[PDB]
Amino acid sequence: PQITLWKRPLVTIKIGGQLKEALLDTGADDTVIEEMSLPGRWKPKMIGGIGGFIKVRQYDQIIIEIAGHKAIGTVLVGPTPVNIIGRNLLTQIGATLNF
C-alpha cells in the first residue's frame, strides 16, 4: 500500500498470538510494544526519546505480522505510550519513505 501521512500511520499487528494497533515509525530504530508476555530469553535495556528513558525487556527472534506481512526481529517490551514498529522490522516488510 501507499500510506499518506495526514493522520498517524497505524496498522494492525499480530504478536504473541495477540492483535494490537501500532504506529509505523521511521524515527524509531527498534520496535517497542506495551507490556505483554513473550516466550524465550530476554535482557534489560534502557531506551530514550522525548521525555527521557524507559526500561524495557529485549526479546530477540520474535515473529510479528505487520498489516499482513510476516517479519522476524527484536522486540522491546515496556511502558511505551504507543506501540511502535521501528526500522528493524520496517526494513523486513520492504517499507520505504517516498517523496
Ligand X SMILES: CC(C)CN(C[C@@H](O)[C@H](Cc1ccccc1)NC(=O)O[C@H]1CO[C@H]2OCC[C@H]21)S(=O)(=O)c1ccc(NC(=O)CCl)cc1
Residues marked active site are found at: 25
In the bound state with Na ion, the residue whose beta carbon lies nearer, of 34 and 58, is 58
d(CA 72, CA 78): 19
Choice from 15, 25, 66, 73 touching Cl ion (CB under 5 A): 73
In the bound state with Cl ion, the residue whose beta carbon lies nearer, of 18 and 91, is 91
Among Cl ion, ligand X, Na ion, none, the one that 61 touches (CB under a kind-dependent 5 to 8 A) is Na ion
Q: And the C-alpha cell for 35?
A: 507490556
Among its own copies, Na ion, ligand X, none, the one that 40 touches (CB under a kind-dependent 5 to 8 A) is Na ion
